[PDB]
Write an enzyme that holds these catalytic residues in place. Sequence first.
Site, PDB file in Angstrom:
ATOM      1  N   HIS B  10      58.776 149.582  57.800  1.00  0.00           N
ATOM      2  CA  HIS B  10      59.129 148.239  57.922  1.00  0.00           C
ATOM      3  C   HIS B  10      60.195 148.211  56.871  1.00  0.00           C
ATOM      4  O   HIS B  10      60.569 146.893  56.503  1.00  0.00           O
ATOM      5  CB  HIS B  10      58.041 147.488  57.477  1.00  0.00           C
ATOM      6  N   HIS B  41      75.989 147.630  76.988  1.00  0.00           N
ATOM      7  CA  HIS B  41      75.636 148.867  78.127  1.00  0.00           C
ATOM      8  C   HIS B  41      74.145 148.780  78.241  1.00  0.00           C
ATOM      9  O   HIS B  41      73.429 149.332  79.537  1.00  0.00           O
ATOM     10  CB  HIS B  41      76.066 150.192  77.938  1.00  0.00           C
ATOM     11  N   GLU B  61      50.430 147.646  65.082  1.00  0.00           N
ATOM     12  CA  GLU B  61      51.314 147.240  63.840  1.00  0.00           C
ATOM     13  C   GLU B  61      51.179 145.928  63.483  1.00  0.00           C
ATOM     14  O   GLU B  61      51.913 145.178  64.136  1.00  0.00           O
ATOM     15  CB  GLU B  61      52.649 147.252  64.408  1.00  0.00           C
ATOM     16  N   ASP B  86      81.453 146.913  73.303  1.00  0.00           N
ATOM     17  CA  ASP B  86      80.281 147.160  73.623  1.00  0.00           C
ATOM     18  C   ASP B  86      79.322 146.248  72.553  1.00  0.00           C
ATOM     19  O   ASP B  86      78.757 146.844  71.924  1.00  0.00           O
ATOM     20  CB  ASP B  86      79.969 148.686  73.498  1.00  0.00           C
ATOM     21  N   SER B 177      70.987 153.725  71.338  1.00  0.00           N
ATOM     22  CA  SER B 177      71.886 152.776  71.737  1.00  0.00           C
ATOM     23  C   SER B 177      71.675 151.529  71.206  1.00  0.00           C
ATOM     24  O   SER B 177      70.561 151.059  71.559  1.00  0.00           O
ATOM     25  CB  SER B 177      72.064 152.782  73.186  1.00  0.00           C
TER      26      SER B 177
END
EC number: 3.4.21.-
Lengths: 166, 223
Positions: B10, B41, B61, B86, B177
């Site tokens: 965290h 993307h 969690e 991007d 990504s």
Amino acid sequence: GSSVVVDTNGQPVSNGADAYYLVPVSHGHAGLALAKIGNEAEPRAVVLDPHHRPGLPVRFESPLFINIIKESYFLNIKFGPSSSDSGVWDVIQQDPIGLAVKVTDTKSLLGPFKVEKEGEGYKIVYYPERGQTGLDIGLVHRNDKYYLAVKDGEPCVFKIRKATDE
Amino acid sequence: IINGEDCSPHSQPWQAALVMENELFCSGVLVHPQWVLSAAHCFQNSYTIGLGLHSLEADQEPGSQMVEASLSVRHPEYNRPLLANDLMLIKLDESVSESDTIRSISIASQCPTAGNSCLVSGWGLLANGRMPTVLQCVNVSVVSEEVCSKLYDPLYHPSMFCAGGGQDQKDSCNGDSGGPLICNGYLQGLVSFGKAPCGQVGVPGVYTNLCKFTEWIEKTVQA
Ligand SMILES: [Cl-]
Ligand SMILES: [Cl-]
């Protein structure tokens, strides 16, 4: 475009990490192989071979740090393990086939293929210069072989099978 | 994340998991209570987003939330030139209450400084080719614009900057990504692209250069 390419079990095709067979939907008896073209002494052209199924497995790769492939991505397509760039696909003018799929030992950062939905499966589309207009990969019959080559409007349609039989 | 280690749980509370049928395919970064920034993307027509996570199992969690979003806007110049610009902004169907495990992060207004050590976090592939069970953190250093263009032209554009490529082989990898590159307290970049395989000596990864987009991001969030 924003469609994710899936395998024959319906799972996303991975970016480079797994290998897959391109299985022809109307020629399930045939599989990808390398053959000789023109006068070359080494086999460098990709054919659909009735003797090999499921044929040579390929990997689809994008420089993007994502581990799935979308139909809009530019892709390199290659035979062989990820650590090798010796079986990278390119499209090369060769008489009398035309624009033939051939294997090379060099890879650009962005390859010139896309994998696009077609019929019941996917076709391979070649984008010369990585521009907007793509040419369908289909089959060219010459010298007793069925060569993967541009045949725009006449795509060979494939389904994509993860290569876990190896 | 190549050659990093478990983040401290965290410690990156802006991290967003984008998941598709319960599998992660990208991250994102909470930059406002109702907006996550990700790589263009990673676009999909809709999202399930995980906030407050460490492992990817929300049921394990406390404080985490799995939220839906339908609206996202890619930057209008995404992929012209190819790979450039991007970024996209995902609008959560409702705003989240911030806490100590779910919080947004401020975007750097200054551009990256060559040489500066920054941190990248994500759940993508490790050096051994497997997926980690918890969020991974790694430091990577900003490479100069001269080195970046040298290695990536003709696809280097100032909507990108390079980081990593060191002897330490610390890098992003597939699955990272869209997630954050943090420099000096602020969100400097998003994981975008690199030349395969990951963690090559002398080959840096490429990240979206967010210092170029602060105005579009603000305008988009306010419209
Ligand atoms: Cl099958
Ligand atoms: Cl000749």
